[PDB]
Symmetry: C2
Subunit: 184 residues, 2 copies
């Protein structure tokens, strides 16, 4: 229990995956961040390279192998000893100190894609989430149709650091609260 | 091609399903609506009861059987001759006259849940969608944390008419554009 454990805290998550159909693809990296309802970061969670065979890595579309390599993820996947369960337990453990099970929706960009894989490879985690999604890209889509000018002034970056990735998804939300919301 | 075919039009969809895990559950109703980017309804699409065995209907959680019956959906499922493909082809056919393939994100409430089932039982349809989700409940979650007062003034209704269901999801969005957005 940290002091800021609260049922309105938000769980951000960003998987790395080896392809898009979970039924032949697997997780290869997992990261999480907890913020308060107002997007103030509380904690950064386990950033973990989940190990996977060399053949599944070899079946990877040429685009993903390029990225994962230049980032260096594969170097970690291949030096990883973590199982999916090891990854998951470690993240759960973490989450548990900051938000109650079932309270936060799943938060990040396009996170429906991540959740497909959780549901198959990390269902306890998938269950730790409220059923609802808090998809930042939802807002991008709306802005692109109802207020595109604000989009010519926010275009984020990568980095081989998952925690930086989440942070930009958050940055992005923070940006829509600013120039696309009316909070009063 | 109707005059208002446009790459920014939005496709709204609402499945009815027999349980939540697609891997043992199936579609039993499908409906769609196309709006323009500004949520003006263009067309209502095929509202179709997809037929499913009596045993899968019998394996249905007691909660879903209650609802589907009082609505009368089952009476249709059971009088249905439509296959998943028949349903799907008919919806595609429809969509094709109003939005290009791959342009609209998937729109409605919690639509990640629907898309799980499309992806397994109606993949051509699932493919007709841009990968991004436009989840109205995303906004509800944000309002509930950053401006809850507006939530004490919008609480929609059911009806055994899918097209009415979508219409409320839309109504809801329309409501957030009003009291939760700042469009300038």
């Amino acid at each position: 229990s940290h002091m800021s454990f609260d049922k309105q805290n938000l769980i951000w998550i960003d998987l790395e995956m080896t392809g898009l159909d979970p039924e032949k693809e697997r997780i290869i990296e997992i990261a999480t961040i907890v913020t308060d309802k107002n997007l103030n970061i509380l904690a950064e969670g386990p950033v973990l390279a989940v190990h996977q065979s060399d053949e599944l890595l070899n079946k990877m579309n040429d685009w993903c192998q390029k990225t994962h390599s230049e980032n260096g993820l594969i170097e970690r996947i291949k030096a990883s000893k973590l199982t999916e369960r090891a990854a998951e337990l470690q993240t759960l453990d973490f989450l548990k100190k900051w938000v109650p099970k079932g309270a936060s929706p799943i938060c990040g960009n396009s996170i429906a894609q991540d959740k497909r894989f959780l549901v198959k490879y990390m269902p306890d985690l998938a269950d730790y989430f409220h059923y609802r999604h808090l998809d930042v890209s939802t807002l991008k889509e709306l802005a692109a149709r109802w207020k595109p000018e604000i989009l010519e002034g926010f275009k984020k970056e990568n980095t081989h650091l998952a925690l930086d990735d989440i942070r930009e998804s958050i940055k992005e939300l923070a940006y829509y609260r600013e120039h696309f919301m009316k909070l009063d």
